[PDB]
Amino acid sequence: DSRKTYTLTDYLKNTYRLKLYSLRWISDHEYLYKQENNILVFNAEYGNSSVFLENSTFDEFGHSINDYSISPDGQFILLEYNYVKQWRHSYTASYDIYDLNKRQLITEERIPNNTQWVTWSPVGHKLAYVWNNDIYVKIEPNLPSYRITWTGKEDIIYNGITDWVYEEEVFSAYSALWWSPNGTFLAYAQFNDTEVPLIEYSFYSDESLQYPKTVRVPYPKAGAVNPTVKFFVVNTDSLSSVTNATSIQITAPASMLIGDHYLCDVTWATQERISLQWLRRIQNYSVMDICDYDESSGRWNCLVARQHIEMSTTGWVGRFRPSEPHFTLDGNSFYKIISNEEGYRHICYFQIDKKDCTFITKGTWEVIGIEALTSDYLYYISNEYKGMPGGRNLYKIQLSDYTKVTCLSCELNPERCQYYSVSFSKEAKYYQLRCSGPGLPLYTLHSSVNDKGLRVLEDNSALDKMLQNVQMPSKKLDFIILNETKFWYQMILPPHFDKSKKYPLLLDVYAGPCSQKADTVFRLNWATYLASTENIIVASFDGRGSGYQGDKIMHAINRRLGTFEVEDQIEAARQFSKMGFVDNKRIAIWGWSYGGYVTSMVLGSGSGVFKCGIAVAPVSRWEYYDSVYTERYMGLPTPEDNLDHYRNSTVMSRAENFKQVEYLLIHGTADDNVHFQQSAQISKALVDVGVDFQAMWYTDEDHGIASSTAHQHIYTHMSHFIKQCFSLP
Amino acid sequence: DSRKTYTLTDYLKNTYRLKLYSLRWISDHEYLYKQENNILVFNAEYGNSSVFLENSTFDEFGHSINDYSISPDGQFILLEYNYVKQWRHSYTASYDIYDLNKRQLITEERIPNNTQWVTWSPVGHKLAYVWNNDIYVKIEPNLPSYRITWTGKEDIIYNGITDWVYEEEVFSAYSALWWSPNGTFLAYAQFNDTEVPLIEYSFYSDESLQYPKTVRVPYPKAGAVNPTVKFFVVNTDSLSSVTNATSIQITAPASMLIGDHYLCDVTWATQERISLQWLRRIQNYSVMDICDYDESSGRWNCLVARQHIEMSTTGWVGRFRPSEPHFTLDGNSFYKIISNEEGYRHICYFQIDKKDCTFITKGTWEVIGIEALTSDYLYYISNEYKGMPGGRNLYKIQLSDYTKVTCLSCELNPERCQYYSVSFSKEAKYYQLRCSGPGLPLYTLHSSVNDKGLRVLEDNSALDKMLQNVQMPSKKLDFIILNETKFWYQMILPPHFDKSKKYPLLLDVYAGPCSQKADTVFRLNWATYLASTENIIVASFDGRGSGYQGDKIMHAINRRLGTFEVEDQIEAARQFSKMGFVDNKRIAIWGWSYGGYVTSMVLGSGSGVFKCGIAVAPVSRWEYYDSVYTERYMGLPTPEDNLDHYRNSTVMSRAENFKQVEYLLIHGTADDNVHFQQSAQISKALVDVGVDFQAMWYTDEDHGIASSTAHQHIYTHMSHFIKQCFSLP
């Protein structure tokens, strides 16, 4: 075999690029696709298309357009530029509205610069945006905006947008506004961070900045003061009729008001019915209110007879939060993924005014998500196929006969495709399937009326050809039995894997709650190069605490992070040793964030199993991480609750054991998520016990250390360290 | 040789300690010396002593005493405890006063806690202390204090104490208080930092601190707004408990008030005459004012006829600032070290009412400092002996005949002693000589009348006995000639040095303006271990910009930092490499602070002479350093002044040239002097050009990285790096 191998430069330069097929449904019949810098519109049924927007339309715009957004009625397009990223989802940008019909740009009553969020109404072309922490609404793109709130205050009062912790841990979005189905009402959340402590750190910026800037962010660490929240609904149809439309507040249940709580879900059911889910700071109790508009009082009332409670005795509620409801068209019933009596998450059917739901699916597997719902069918993704927790397939279940369940993707290409994600058209008339492994990604279009494949959108044939001239590694996905329980793992094996030989092994770990590192997804990453070029076996293992396998496994680390998930990774290392093809003298471990925490906990366990390890932006002490995430699994860091385990699960307390291993600690100085503070304390602890180790800080990089140059630099640095640790005499 | 070598542990554990003999003159006949915790009083003429303070006197004090300060009359003793260090000289503490007469500690009107500075009057036992930025005076230790100033305000107004920059760069002291000879007047300066920007950086503290703290220090970087200053004098003999004391201000000369300036020196001439030197922000022009107290008006007048100007056309004034004047008994004239027409620093004799001073010493060598003055002789230290710049001896010059100069230490012990410092008694009746090299430190006491050598106070015979059982390195001090000029260097040579062999070489560099790294001083440091145990030659070179050799050499880098001093280190190494005993393939370079800057500039010069290098807390861009030090040599960073060279002398611009060298960058995160920012910018530049390097941050360590654990950890990390770099493949 004289073929080249997949090198580090290949990975860092992205020589072998996976092609994608990102489309945007604009209706139940067509979608927009960007090709040749121009926006094309495709007819799903026949595959024919037209030039929706010539790539030359805005050559003299004067700005590089970051993204586009077509109004629901296709009459206008929102141009986004001057994009400036903030956290994981938040960012600010400038916007110009283009009239597609008059093929002219709107220059009157423009959306202001430094806008925090903007979104079209579900129908028509109304606009709601947040600027300087206040909400504004534009009925017509060229007309003056109506101000909705006057409380907005930087880092203090957030209207229509989330604060740091709500963005990252609760809504996974910066937006905190929800239009009603036909756009009449605009609902929104308001966060008050007045007493939330601030994390502060330096930002050096370009060399030209003489004095470092101090970034300050309202961020509640474990047990600190959380932001408070309020919910409001305003009738946008009355804006042009009244000088100041009233925002009607919907107060949280008394069961929530008794203490700290969170607004965790907002979902409209009908034009005049909205559901809200609240969660107690002690995340094992959630309440869902279903509220109707009272046309006579202009108020929103939530009948207790329509209030649903969801709690957990073994852990927290939901995988990462209470699941969202999926309402029937009439809004009188909904479907929700919840853990059944066996601890497996399945779809339960609810009548809004009946507290007991009916499970429509069941078994020793789990529903991953509900993708679409029609009057006759509900489509969902699950890992039922072949009992593989790391596989994903699309299923269709007949609402009039639950025994009728069809897997729409399982047999499309069983050898190449075992992991799917889907994208349905507006009314689920068509759906695009996205296969992401174990083979190369395959994109296909299908018609729901007969479930027939319409055509292949992208099969990555080009890339496949290229990879032929390369000695690519292989992936082994299997399981090992521990205490009569099955635990999955995967190994990226180097080319020509020979079981009679001894290969050095690198344990790629994450292991956070409900995590999954053993799956059927195909990836071109650092591990690819390590296996391919350095002949290193890169393994990952899903032990206790991992998700998609039922609550018995997932809740195993409840109130006890830093234990079972850590111990199991070590045991997994021993197990792989027993397999016979591993050089026990060369076993390393590495991880990012939670993975860095587990890596450090393992390296400081004194097991003697690992020779070296690399921790990137690791958590080191739970009281340093945020409240929402941490408390969900750890409760409160108080004597009366769980302070003892909080203080017993730190990386610092194991400092002395690092004398037995080679350690590389890496962290970006501008990490707003896992603060540099966390690694700063690890290093100080190691220095205090006289432990030598390697370190690397990345100036102004955040938790992702993803800038082009930093990305190349960190993996290069880590490669040298791994090669050095495995180098033989 | 079977003897042990001087190991890294020996250095880190202080196994081989130099004995000292720190004495405190209390008169012209006696001195205090702490021996075994008990304070003894010695008679200089006979050497007999008595116990002044029992070491058991405060057994039940309840506080670990940090230091003692006996009043001039010996009636009281200030006990310092609860010491909390701030910057290089500043710190706060608690004080209690013990009455040696009543043999009891005063409990009435005790000095407050968190006192910033305290000092006895020159004679008697009055006290003056600063608390919360305000000055207080106590005529008697057990009496109520009189508040002198009421404007004190943290980080804004400083009365009697210096701000960050004045402490570090001007007075090298936290105190800004100056008692008159007999204690009548108390002079002080007031600093206003109102508009001085603040440097901000994080302090993590103990693990228990959930949120890192943000330290903020008024720190003027190059070209930024500087603190303003005012000078005051108050009569402590006319203080009242009913009315507030009256402070008389002495304004600066008009030639200073025309722009930004500094107060750079305060020295009392007589009971009613005080001299002050002011320096323009453009530090090549200073002025001395001589002010006399007017008993009639009770004010201070500074006659213009008694004004003395000191300027420089080749660089700045003084080594690091204008020198201090030494007044005669009557205070009608004074001696001061200034650069002569040849650019060599010599002693000039001034008449307060005359503009032209007369040089009393001359030659191609320099006077280091004036040590004592009587009516017949002026005693000073100089490097004249044997034309050795790095040597130092004590001389006395007959005031009536300047041709009569006598060296008092040159021939005491030429082989062991070539570097001295001295301590004269109150009226120069006796002097203690401190020999610090090239042999082991030797402390001796002498009498001035006939310069008799009375006795040996400490000869370090114990250490000599220990070192005899160790393979100690030797030191070679020599010179090389560059462009007709002689430049000195030193090499720490490993034991049994064999010129027929090749040794790797480490260039230990500092190279700052007026620096001297090539001298005759005996040291036990990292280099001692590198030469003794690792057989590494550690060399240092004093090129252009170095001091004590005249302004032609020192001012060579005027307005040009980062040029000739960097070039000369490369040239020196290039020449050392051509010597037969140096392995040109294994030459490294390392430095701390300014040494880190030069080390970085050298490694990024592309010379190809150095294989690896280590930079600790390096300056990387002059606009990042403070104004007083930076501007002294670089002028202002403005287009009209010297901005271009500020921008061309950064480490960052040379990032690409680090491609072929191994580099280790280290820096404490709490460095208040050379901000972590400087290294944060270096790392970012290296990352931006794809250059790999080694790094290490020290959580919460300042510029000294001197905490016990951090000290051992950094030198251990650097040792591994050096050995690895010099490892024979």
Ligand SMILES: *[C@@H]1O[C@H](CO)[C@@H](O[C@@H]2O[C@H](CO)[C@@H](O)[C@H](O)[C@H]2NC(C)=O)[C@H](O)[C@H]1NC(C)=O
């Ligand atoms: C955000 O919450 C703070 C409380 O932390 C509110 O501030 C209080 O407001 C009341 C009413 O004006 C005052 O009497 C209190 O003195 C305030 N306390 C504080 C902490 O400042 C604030 O009103 C809230 N903001 C909004 C818009 O709801």
Ligand SMILES: *[C@@H]1O[C@H](CO)[C@@H](O[C@@H]2O[C@H](CO)[C@@H](O)[C@H](O)[C@H]2NC(C)=O)[C@H](O)[C@H]1NC(C)=O
């Ligand atoms: C629209 O109505 C809101 C709510 O009443 C007004 O906001 C109040 O303004 C007063 C006076 O400025 C404050 O004392 C209240 O605290 C505000 N309440 C809230 C919830 O913000 C707002 O000023 C009105 N806008 C207009 C244009 O009249």
Ligand SMILES: *[C@@H]1O[C@H](CO)[C@@H](O[C@@H]2O[C@H](CO)[C@@H](O)[C@H](O)[C@H]2NC(C)=O)[C@H](O)[C@H]1NC(C)=O
């Ligand atoms: C969107 O839904 C809203 C609420 O159902 C509609 O507004 C109501 O319309 C009915 C007539 O169908 C009126 O009797 C009510 O007074 C309206 N109330 C509100 C909320 O303003 C609205 O018409 C719908 N949009 C359209 C026209 O499709």
Ligand SMILES: *[C@@H]1O[C@H](CO)[C@@H](O[C@@H]2O[C@H](CO)[C@@H](O)[C@H](O)[C@H]2NC(C)=O)[C@H](O)[C@H]1NC(C)=O
């Ligand atoms: C310290 O210096 C500041 C200026 O740097 C002085 O404040 C100024 O005072 C004058 C007169 O009161 C005002 O007109 C200015 O606006 C002030 N400057 C500012 C803050 O912008 C201050 O008085 C000085 N403090 C002392 C005790 O001398």
Ligand SMILES: *[C@@H]1O[C@H](CO)[C@@H](O[C@@H]2O[C@H](CO)[C@@H](O)[C@H](O)[C@H]2NC(C)=O)[C@H](O)[C@H]1NC(C)=O
């Ligand atoms: C310290 O020096 C001062 C100033 O010379 C002395 O005080 C002066 O004493 C004379 C009397 O000899 C008075 O006429 C002056 O008015 C005093 N000056 C003042 C304070 O304005 C003081 O006595 C000296 N201290 C001692 C006693 O040695």
Ligand SMILES: *[C@@H]1O[C@H](CO[C@@H]2O[C@@H](C)[C@@H](O)[C@@H](O)[C@@H]2O)[C@@H](O)[C@H](O)[C@H]1NC(C)=O
């Ligand atoms: C796509 O093409 C449509 C017409 O397609 C033709 O007629 C249908 C009934 C079939 O017979 C088909 O095979 C023929 O090609 C247009 O109506 C439609 O606007 C086109 N869509 C776009 C976006 O170009």
Ligand SMILES: *[C@@H]1O[C@H](CO[C@@H]2O[C@@H](C)[C@@H](O)[C@@H](O)[C@@H]2O)[C@@H](O)[C@H](O)[C@H]1NC(C)=O
């Ligand atoms: C030191 O001793 C002094 C007396 O010493 C004696 O007298 C002098 C004149 C010489 O003849 C000497 O040889 C004798 O031993 C004391 O007066 C003095 O207080 C002592 N000093 C201290 C502080 O111990």
Ligand SMILES: *[C@@H]1O[C@H](CO)[C@@H](O)[C@H](O)[C@H]1NC(C)=O
């Ligand atoms: C946005 O800011 C730019 C300046 O960069 C200005 O020219 C433009 O007119 C502004 N437009 C808006 C939204 O007001």
Ligand SMILES: *[C@@H]1O[C@H](CO)[C@@H](O)[C@H](O)[C@H]1NC(C)=O
């Ligand atoms: C929720 O958690 C708290 C704290 O651990 C516990 O006391 C309470 O019983 C739990 N409630 C549920 C839903 O079981």
Ligand SMILES: *[C@@H]1O[C@H](CO)[C@@H](O)[C@H](O)[C@H]1NC(C)=O
């Ligand atoms: C200094 O602080 C201690 C601790 O509170 C206190 O006991 C003592 O009285 C204080 N001293 C003074 C001078 O106030």
Ligand SMILES: *[C@@H]1O[C@H](CO)[C@@H](O)[C@H](O)[C@H]1NC(C)=O
């Ligand atoms: C002294 O000055 C301070 C500050 O102005 C003032 O508070 C105090 O009352 C004055 N003392 C008297 C009574 O003269």
Ligand SMILES: *[C@@H]1O[C@H](CO)[C@@H](O)[C@H](O)[C@H]1NC(C)=O
């Ligand atoms: C002082 O230095 C400045 C800056 O170079 C220069 O312009 C000026 O002429 C110098 N004056 C003296 C004292 O020679």
